[PDB]
Design a protein around this nucleic acid. Structure first.
Lengths: 88, 115, 84, 96
RNA sequence: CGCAGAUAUCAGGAGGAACACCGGUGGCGAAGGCGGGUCUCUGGGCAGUAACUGACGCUGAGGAGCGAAAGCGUGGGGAGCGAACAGGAUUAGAUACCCUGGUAGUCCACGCCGUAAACGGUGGGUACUAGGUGUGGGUUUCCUUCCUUGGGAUCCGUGCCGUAGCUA
């Protein structure tokens, strides 16, 4: 799972300042990290459906946050996107 | 030859009753059952069969040289203690009782229900 | 001098009774360990089986913790399980 | 590292003059991984609940460790593949 | 089935499914469902602090995914149970209950189908609306021993009784 160490790393890079958690940038970054790890897990475990549901939920809220940020400021949107390497 | 002290196994079920004498090691000397007593089919669940069977086997063990017995019981038996009374009537000393009816830890599937 | 209930006299008692009991935090304990079999032998019968909560008093937390310990103990033969 | 506490039971044919170094021969592999806290208890020659391979007693032993998952697994593997050990069981000291 | 030496009993070994007492109006899971034990990997929920963004929320045609059991396919394995099926017995006759036996199947891996009384026969989200009573979890203050179904308040989930209200 995610530790305080990893979270503070990601919040040091993507966090607006040292306190922010509600930053959509930070939130999206953490979710995508979590999802990369979980996908590595599901490489082996093709059958952990109870975990795949969590995966889908996280994808849902990820795209919601992206959708919010694009509603607000597409510059910031694509900055974050190119910064994380997503396709959307 | 002979053995002065040994052990006894008593298997009482719904449709039959049977006993066997044996050393504590596992070597039988003598046994009896309701089929050798003479009853047949459906009569031989009653405790009277237990009386007669245990009595005959105890006398056989008296013959082969037994005087004291360890007693081990097993199964649904209407006439367990009936057989016990028959044994202690036959002239034998009750060593130790234990109600080891074999219970499993939720293992092999039993059959279905009847009606 | 006083009754088991109608305890209008002392503070709210730090004592246990027949309905109420939390027997481990109460007394009879060092710590929940599958090592200490003399303690685990108290939550059984002579036939080796395990007690219930409305017999003992434990919370489900302690109950399940202790049962798991017991069961590990029977696996490592530190405790006489019921058998032949 | 993760803390663990291992149990082992052994035949009485061994002796307390052999117990500790015999195990440390294995546990050096872990000591050269973490500088791991090894801490042994020995309270053996103790009668059993029931016989394993017709042994009325065993030489119980408890082994506190702070190590890693791979190392505990490989330890278990070497011990179970050994000719001497009856049992071994592995339990985590921590919350889970 | 035995009378070619059974049943029983004992010593040992081989073996594969299910894992008593904990365990029940009790916990988790969106639903299906979920307990032998240990390790690994991972998910969700609850409470408190309420530091952070600042309405980003709810629903959702279509659509995708999961989904009891029985079934299907390739492979493996196969103790017990047991569709079919054979016999016995009852029966007016019994292709059925009952008895003896017993194949596919139940089990494992990988894929399929995608249904049920899949039921709380109550779609989801939200605010207010008399209470009492047990109960699981976590906070917290007082008689305070402060080792307590302590007691009270509070939050979440779960059952019983019961007002107004509502319903043929």
């Amino acid at each position: 799972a995610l530790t305080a160490e990893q979270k503070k790393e990601i919040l040091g890079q993507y966090g607006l300042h040292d306190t922010d958690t509600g930053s959509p940038e930070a939130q999206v970054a953490l979710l995508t990290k979590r999802i990369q790890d979980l996908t590595e897990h599901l490489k082996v475990h093709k059958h952990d459906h109870h975990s795949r549901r969590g995966l889908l939920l996280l994808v849902g809220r990820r795209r919601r946050l992206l959708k919010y940020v694009a509603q607000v400021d597409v510059a910031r949107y694509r900055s974050l996107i190119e910064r994380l390497g997503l396709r959307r | 030859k002979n053995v002065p002290h040994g052990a006894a196994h008593i298997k009482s079920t719904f449709n039959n009753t049977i006993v066997s004498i044996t050393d504590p090691q596992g070597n039988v000397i003598a046994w009896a059952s309701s089929g050798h007593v003479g009853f047949k089919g459906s009569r031989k669940s009653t405790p009277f069969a237990a009386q007669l069977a245990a009595e005959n086997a105890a006398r056989k063990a008296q013959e082969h040289g037994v005087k004291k017995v360890d007693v081990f019981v097993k199964g649904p038996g209407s006439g367990r203690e009936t057989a016990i009374r028959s044994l202690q009537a036959a002239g034998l000393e009750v060593g130790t009782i234990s109600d080891v009816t074999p219970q499993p830890h939720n293992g092999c599937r039993p059959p279905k229900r009847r009606r | 001098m006083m009754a088991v209930k109608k305890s209008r006299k002392r503070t709210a008692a730090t004592e246990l009774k027949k309905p109420r009991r939390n027997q481990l935090e109460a007394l009879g304990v060092t710590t929940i360990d599958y090592k200490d079999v003399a303690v685990l032998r108290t939550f059984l019968s002579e036939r080796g089986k395990i007690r219930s909560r409305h017999v003992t008093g434990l919370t489900p937390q302690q109950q399940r913790q202790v049962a798991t310990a017991i069961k590990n103990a029977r696996e490592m033969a530190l405790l006489p399980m019921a058998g032949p | 590292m993760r803390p663990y506490e291992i149990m082992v039971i052994l035949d009485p044919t061994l002796d307390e003059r052999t117990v500790a170094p015999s195990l440390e021969t294995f546990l050096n592999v872990i000591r050269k991984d973490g500088g791991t806290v090894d801490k042994v208890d020995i309270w053996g020659r103790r009668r059993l609940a029931y016989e394993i391979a017709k042994h009325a007693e065993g030489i119980y032993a408890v082994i506190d460790v702070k190590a890693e998952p791979a190392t505990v697994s490989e330890l278990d593997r070497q011990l179970n593949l050994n000719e001497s050990v009856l049992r071994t069981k592995v339990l985590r000291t921590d919350k889970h």
